[PDB]
Structure 1
Amino acid sequence: VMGFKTRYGIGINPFAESAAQAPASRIQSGMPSILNSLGKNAYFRRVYVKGI
């Protein structure tokens, strides 16, 4: 019987959303989610391309 295992977690930059003066409750998750970072991370931008 054989296999393998890992652990590494995940997280984001505290100011990545750039869309608020401050986060709710003075405590949040650093783990990205639909309520935290989807479509909000200031470090990245996406553009679709068509018609080359």
Structure 2
Amino acid sequence: VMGFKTRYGIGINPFAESAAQAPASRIQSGMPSILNSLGKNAYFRRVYVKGI
């Protein structure tokens, strides 16, 4: 038998939100939860394109 294993974690860059002068609670998750990052990361902007 055999198989392969990986461990990593991903996360949100501090100040990615851009919309605030201060963080909540001072210890925050860096994970992309809905509240923390859905549609909020200032480093990226998405546009749908129609009509091509």
SS of 2:25's equivalent in the other structure is: helix
Task: Name the CA distance, whole Å, in 1 between partners of 2:46 and 2:28.
Answer: 26
Superposed CA offset, 1:23-48 (max 9, x none): 11111011111010110000000101
Residue 44 (structure 2) pairs with residue 44 (structure 1): yes
Q: Which residue in the other structure is 1:22 paired with? A: 22
- Name the TM-score, length of structure 2 as normaliser: 0.90
Task: Name the CA distance, whole Å, in 2 between partners of 1:2 and 1:14.
Answer: 39
Q: How many residues align?
A: 52
Deviation at 1:12, TM superposition (A): 1.4
User: Structure 2 unaligned runs (5+)?
Assistant: none
User: Structure 1 unaligned runs (5+)?
Assistant: none
Deviates most, 39-48 or 24-33? 24-33
- Name the TM-score, length of structure 1 as normaliser: 0.90
RMSD over aligned Cα atoms: 0.8
